[PDB]
Design an enzyme around this catalytic site. Structure first.
Site, PDB file in Angstrom:
ATOM      1  N   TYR A 186       0.871  -1.144  -0.008  1.00 14.46           N
ATOM      2  CA  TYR A 186      -0.156  -0.200  -0.056  1.00 14.46           C
ATOM      3  C   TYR A 186       0.948   1.291   0.063  1.00 14.46           C
ATOM      4  O   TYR A 186       1.999   1.070   0.505  1.00 14.46           O
ATOM      5  CB  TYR A 186      -0.849  -0.025   1.130  1.00 14.46           C
ATOM      6  CG  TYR A 186      -0.313   0.275   2.729  1.00 14.46           C
ATOM      7  CD1 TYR A 186      -0.088   1.604   2.930  1.00 14.46           C
ATOM      8  CD2 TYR A 186       0.153  -0.977   3.289  1.00 14.46           C
ATOM      9  CE1 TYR A 186       0.521   1.833   4.294  1.00 14.46           C
ATOM     10  CE2 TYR A 186       0.628  -0.389   4.438  1.00 14.46           C
ATOM     11  CZ  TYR A 186       0.893   0.828   4.970  1.00 14.46           C
ATOM     12  OH  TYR A 186       1.616   1.309   6.260  1.00 14.46           O
ATOM     13  N   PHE A 236       2.268   9.855   2.998  1.00 10.46           N
ATOM     14  CA  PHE A 236       2.558   9.737   4.587  1.00 10.46           C
ATOM     15  C   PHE A 236       3.085   8.570   4.807  1.00 10.46           C
ATOM     16  O   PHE A 236       3.709   8.357   6.086  1.00 10.46           O
ATOM     17  CB  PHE A 236       1.544  10.267   5.372  1.00 10.46           C
ATOM     18  CG  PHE A 236       0.442   9.534   5.352  1.00 10.46           C
ATOM     19  CD1 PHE A 236      -0.088   8.398   6.049  1.00 10.46           C
ATOM     20  CD2 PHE A 236      -0.473   9.813   4.286  1.00 10.46           C
ATOM     21  CE1 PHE A 236      -1.259   7.748   6.035  1.00 10.46           C
ATOM     22  CE2 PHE A 236      -1.954   9.150   4.146  1.00 10.46           C
ATOM     23  CZ  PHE A 236      -2.118   8.085   5.186  1.00 10.46           C
ATOM     24  N   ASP A 237       2.531   7.116   3.926  1.00 14.79           N
ATOM     25  CA  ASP A 237       3.096   5.962   4.581  1.00 14.79           C
ATOM     26  C   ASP A 237       3.063   4.991   3.601  1.00 14.79           C
ATOM     27  O   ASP A 237       2.185   5.240   2.594  1.00 14.79           O
ATOM     28  CB  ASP A 237       2.182   5.496   5.698  1.00 14.79           C
ATOM     29  CG  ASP A 237       2.477   4.097   6.223  1.00 14.79           C
ATOM     30  OD1 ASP A 237       3.815   4.015   6.413  1.00 14.79           O
ATOM     31  OD2 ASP A 237       1.795   3.351   6.917  1.00 14.79           O
ATOM     32  N   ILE A 274      -7.767   1.033   9.884  1.00 10.76           N
ATOM     33  CA  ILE A 274      -8.866   1.954   9.788  1.00 10.76           C
ATOM     34  C   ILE A 274     -10.388   1.506   9.068  1.00 10.76           C
ATOM     35  O   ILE A 274     -10.222   0.312   8.388  1.00 10.76           O
ATOM     36  CB  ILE A 274      -8.422   3.208   8.962  1.00 10.76           C
ATOM     37  CG1 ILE A 274      -8.058   3.130   7.609  1.00 10.76           C
ATOM     38  CG2 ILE A 274      -7.729   4.111   9.928  1.00 10.76           C
ATOM     39  CD1 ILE A 274      -7.683   4.382   6.756  1.00 10.76           C
ATOM     40  N   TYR A 327      -9.071   8.951  10.231  1.00 11.22           N
ATOM     41  CA  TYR A 327      -8.618   9.261  11.632  1.00 11.22           C
ATOM     42  C   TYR A 327      -9.350  10.273  12.076  1.00 11.22           C
ATOM     43  O   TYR A 327      -8.902  11.143  12.924  1.00 11.22           O
ATOM     44  CB  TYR A 327      -6.796   9.965  11.410  1.00 11.22           C
ATOM     45  CG  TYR A 327      -5.947   8.417  11.079  1.00 11.22           C
ATOM     46  CD1 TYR A 327      -5.945   8.100   9.644  1.00 11.22           C
ATOM     47  CD2 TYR A 327      -5.348   7.877  12.041  1.00 11.22           C
ATOM     48  CE1 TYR A 327      -5.297   6.935   9.614  1.00 11.22           C
ATOM     49  CE2 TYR A 327      -4.557   6.903  11.693  1.00 11.22           C
ATOM     50  CZ  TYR A 327      -4.482   6.450  10.531  1.00 11.22           C
ATOM     51  OH  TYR A 327      -3.835   5.215  10.037  1.00 11.22           O
ATOM     52  N   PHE A 352      -5.525   5.758  -0.759  1.00 15.14           N
ATOM     53  CA  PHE A 352      -4.717   4.716  -0.641  1.00 15.14           C
ATOM     54  C   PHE A 352      -4.578   3.793  -1.857  1.00 15.14           C
ATOM     55  O   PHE A 352      -5.572   3.665  -2.606  1.00 15.14           O
ATOM     56  CB  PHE A 352      -5.019   3.736   0.409  1.00 15.14           C
ATOM     57  CG  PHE A 352      -4.686   4.142   2.099  1.00 15.14           C
ATOM     58  CD1 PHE A 352      -5.655   5.001   2.564  1.00 15.14           C
ATOM     59  CD2 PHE A 352      -3.622   3.907   2.488  1.00 15.14           C
ATOM     60  CE1 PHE A 352      -5.677   5.529   3.770  1.00 15.14           C
ATOM     61  CE2 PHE A 352      -3.418   4.249   3.938  1.00 15.14           C
ATOM     62  CZ  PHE A 352      -4.478   5.310   4.595  1.00 15.14           C
TER      63      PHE A 352
END
Length: 108
Positions: free
Chosen positions: A27, A37-38, A57, A83, A100
């Site tokens: 991902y 961010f990730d 999530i 979030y 994502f």
């Protein structure tokens, strides 16, 4: 909104994750502006989670469940499924819609 699933490349079209199975994914997570961010790809190690255990999530739980094995999909996730109003200090701002890029590699 909840989670919008948009296909990037098709999977087998037949094998969908069921509750209790472990999903193995690659991902990349980005803010709505496109800032990453990730990403599991940058770590060269796939990410595993067990569906239905709230290890991820809500957008992932409901979104990955709609993917078939081998599929790559774009998930757009509203903050309530993400979030929330609080976000995540220094990584995810308040009220963030997240995008994502997710590839479902296999189920365990």
């Amino acid at each position: 909104m909840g989670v919008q699933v948009e296909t990037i490349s098709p999977g087998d079209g037949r094998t969908f994750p069921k509750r209790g199975q472990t999903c193995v994914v690659h991902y990349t997570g980005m803010l709505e502006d496109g800032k990453k961010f990730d990403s599991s790809r940058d770590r060269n190690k796939p990410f595993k989670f067990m569906l239905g255990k709230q290890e991820v999530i809500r957008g992932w739980e409901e979104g990955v469940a709609q993917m078939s094995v081998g599929q790559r999909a774009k998930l757009t996730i509203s903050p309530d499924y993400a979030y929330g109003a609080t976000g995540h200090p220094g990584i995810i701002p308040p009220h963030a819609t997240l995008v994502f890029d997710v590839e479902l590699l296999k189920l365990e």
